[PDB]
């Protein structure tokens, strides 16, 4: 007999590590349908900011225009969402972008010959021969000056090589960075990889003490199995440390003395980030999206 | 296509999330059906899958010159030992989970890195359609050729296939 | 012989003759052998298969008998024979890299795959011919699985987010 | 051409690590497997993108119709 | 190791083409039946 008060008696979270870019943590005693839905929403439904419309004024370099437009969109921007709003598509392009929807980046690079002493390195040999992603400067439109004064728009990885040039060539563009979700295009996905794994279960069946237990160590990562003596013989220290290689299931000594399975309601989330948001904050957004994905169906008339 | 004659069209740009995901978080770029391999007998693709994943982990290139290995020096033993030192399964199998349901799969999935090619003929220069258009001046029939917005041919045998159904109005 | 080819000793030194190198077993030196000679010789394939007092020559490498494009197929001795023959035709018809001097040419049409990669699994003759100057393809994490249902009889499944990040994009 | 910005499979930013990779192989003189692990590439999806990149843009840029050869 | 991708050997060669001698000499030998057959019209014995 299930109840939401019985779910709360038996639900735990163990946070193994938290960081600016990644977070490993456990969700104990939750169903696979709910734990998949948090993974499902972190990849797609959580919105993030990326460049969408690119306006080339000149591109005289070797890289094509649409290839170089595609490379700007994949550059992750260090912008907090809930500082922008959503664009509205049922109205024309003069009315579509405001200072509340859009972040305007620009890029203006020209390459020239450098007088240098001599196969020489082309950073000592040319001026502006490498367009990095930090050369996308932020242009505050409208009132994005008193609200972005704390945090200007900078790419999350400023050393991304966008293009390479030779003298004579130039790149002069201007891009609009709109808010979108990972289901539309992959460049809005706010996460490098969110994924989970089940806790492995390593069930020893017979006591396998002694010299067999020393060779039982080596079928696993080193922190997994431990020994003490013939008593406290060969036990599991850290099954969470184990990757399921099934190395022990191919030695005929051990193929009946152990069984490998999972703990089917212990999920180990590893949530990384593309830099725009902290990884514990794209999990709070993900559980609030699924809550607000259900309110909008409850607070809704059932048609026909 | 891969380097083994295993070609086939892209059937669906399958969305990312409901695509199976490994223990590592890696989601495959290409899913290929195992039912190709029994009639094809392309086992160079199984060992390329197994040597490529060994090579990505250890940072090494592997040789695949033919007749380097031997019946006493099977490459499944050679590259599987390199996976087992890396920490993976010996047989190239990986524990994957279902992207749709969320549960783990029945067995482990054979994953690896295969060098895929992209062939040069695509649907954007294969498809055609005609409601009506330019005709020929002698026969008043639709013209041959796609760029001239021309027509599909109902040849000799397709006439016979419509007499065989007994449908005289489709033939008409 | 008895009712065989007409006997004789025929030297040839002219133009246009086919010639390939083998190792002459006394002196361990390279010899050059043409196809008229080869019918009556005894050329061992590997040095491990040199039998006493029949073999006078040995191949340098057994891969001197394949083509250039048939020699780049990884582990070609494990595929079935029509599949190594079909890669040799599919390897021509890829969109790869025609050349780098494309701004000084004007052809009817060129196909240019944008971001090529070298292979992890490759032959040693991939580097002798300088095939790195023309990268033809890319390395995909391929999973052999029947999962979706849309991949039958030859069809495959691409990833969507792999494609949005540019995966076999070409002009 | 130029290094891809993101990995194809996972989606980690990979484009900022190509010039750091060539410094490690040239200046610090490591092998390829140790230089990739020091840049943070550890899933073998993103590991084979810096590893296996050709970088043909240095071969395209030699042909420049905007300056005297 | 068994084989290698020659990553620093490519990148020093893409930027700096060799000023003396063609690398990859097996590639110029693979069209010696064509280039040589046209060279024999004007070179060799008896002009």
């Amino acid at each position: 007999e299930w109840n939401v008060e019985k779910f709360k008696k038996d639900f735990e979270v163990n946070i193994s590590s938290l960081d600016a870019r990644e977070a490993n943590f456990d969700l104990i005693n939750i169903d696979t349908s709910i734990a998949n839905a948090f993974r499902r929403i972190m990849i797609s439904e959580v919105p993030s900011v990326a460049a969408e419309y690119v306006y080339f004024f000149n591109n005289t370099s070797v890289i094509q225009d649409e290839v170089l437009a595609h490379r700007i969109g994949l550059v992750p921007l260090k912008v907090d969402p809930d500082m922008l709003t959503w664009v509205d598509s049922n109205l024309p392009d003069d009315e579509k972008f405001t200072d509340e929807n859009t972040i305007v980046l620009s890029l203006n690079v020209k390459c020239t010959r450098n007088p240098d002493a001599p196969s020489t390195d082309p950073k000592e040999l040319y001026n502006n021969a490498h367009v990095y992603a930090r050369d996308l400067k932020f242009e505050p439109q409208g009132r994005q000056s008193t609200t972005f004064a704390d945090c200007p728009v900078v790419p999350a990885d400023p050393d991304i090589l966008l293009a390479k040039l030779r003298p004579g060539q130039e790149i002069s563009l201007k891009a609009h960075c709109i808010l979108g979700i990972g289901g539309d295009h992959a460049k809005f996905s706010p996460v490098s990889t969110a994924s989970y794994r089940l806790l492995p279960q390593i069930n020893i069946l017979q006591p396998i003490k002694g010299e067999s237990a020393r060779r039982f160590q080596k079928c696993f990562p080193p922190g997994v199995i431990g020994i003490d003596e013939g008593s406290d013989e060969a036990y599991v220290k850290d099954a969470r440390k184990d990757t399921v290689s099934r190395e022990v299931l191919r030695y005929e000594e051990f193929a009946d003395k152990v069984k490998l399975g999972r703990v089917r309601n212990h999920f180990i989330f590893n949530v990384e980030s593309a830099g725009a948001m902290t990884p514990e904050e794209i999990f709070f957004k993900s559980v609030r999206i699924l809550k607000n994905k259900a309110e909008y169906l409850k607070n809704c008339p059932i048609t026909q | 296509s891969s380097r083994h004659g295993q070609k086939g069209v892209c059937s669906r740009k399958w969305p990312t999330i409901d695509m199976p995901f490994s223990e590592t978080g890696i989601q495959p770029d290409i899913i290929i059906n195992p039912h190709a391999f029994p009639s094809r007998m392309t086992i160079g693709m199984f060992v390329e899958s197994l040597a490529g994943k060994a090579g990505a982990l250890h940072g090494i290139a592997q040789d695949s010159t033919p007749w380097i290995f031997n019946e006493d020096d099977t490459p499944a033993d050679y590259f599987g030992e390199q996976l087992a030192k890396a920490g993976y399964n010996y047989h190239g199998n990986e524990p994957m989970y279902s992207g749709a349901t969320g549960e783990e799969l029945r067995a482990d999935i054979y994953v690896g890195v295969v060098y895929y090619q992209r062939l040069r003929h695509m649907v954007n220069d294969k498809f055609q359609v005609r409601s009506t258009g330019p005709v020929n001046s002698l026969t008043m029939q639709p013209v041959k050729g796609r760029k001239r917005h021309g027509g599909i041919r109902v040849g000799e045998m397709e006439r016979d296939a419509l007499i065989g159904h007994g449908t005289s109005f489709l033939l008409q | 012989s008895t009712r065989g080819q007409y006997p004789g000793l025929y030297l040839f030194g002219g133009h246009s003759r086919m010639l390939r190198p083998v190792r002459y077993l006394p002196l361990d030196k390279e010899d050059i052998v043409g196809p008229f000679e080869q019918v009556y010789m005894n050329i061992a394939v590997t040095p491990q298969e040199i039998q006493n007092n029949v073999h006078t020559h040995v191949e340098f490498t057994p891969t001197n008998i394949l083509s250039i494009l048939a020699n780049l197929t990884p582990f070609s001795d494990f595929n079935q024979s029509p599949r190594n023959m079909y890669q040799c035709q599919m390897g021509k018809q890829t969109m790869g890299t025609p050349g780098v001097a494309l701004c000084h040419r004007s052809d009817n049409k060129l196909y240019r795959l944008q971001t090529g990669q070298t292979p992890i699994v490759k032959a040693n003759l991939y580097d002798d011919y300088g095939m790195d100057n023309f990268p033809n393809g890319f390395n995909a994490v391929v999973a052999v699985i029947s999962y979706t249902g849309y991949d039958m009889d030859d069809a495959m499944i691409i990833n969507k987010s792999a494609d949005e990040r540019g995966f076999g994009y070409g002009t | 051409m130029i290094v891809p910005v993101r990995c194809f499979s996972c989606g980690k930013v990979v484009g900022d690590k190509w010039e750091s990779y060539l410094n490690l192989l040239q200046e610090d003189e490591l092998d390829e497997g140790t230089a990739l692990s020091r840049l943070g590439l550890k899933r073998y999806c993103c590991r084979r993108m810096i590893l296996t990149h050709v970088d043909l843009i240095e071969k395209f840029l030699r042909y420049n119709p905007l300056e005297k050869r | 190791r068994t084989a290698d991708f020659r990553t620093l050997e490519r990148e020093s060669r893409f930027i700096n083409p060799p000023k003396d001698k063609s690398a990859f000499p097996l590639l110029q030998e693979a069209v010696q039946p064509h280039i040589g057959s046209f060279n024999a019209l004007t070179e060799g014995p008896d002009g």
Partner: peptide
């Protein structure tokens, strides 16, 4: 016939999620 030369110098390069080099 000499065998295919084993590459010497391999080590563990795949770890569980949340564990980098805690193994010696």
């Amino acid at each position: 016939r000499k065998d295919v030369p084993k590459v010497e110098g391999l080590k563990l390069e795949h770890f569980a999620t949340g564990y980098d080099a805690e193994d010696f």
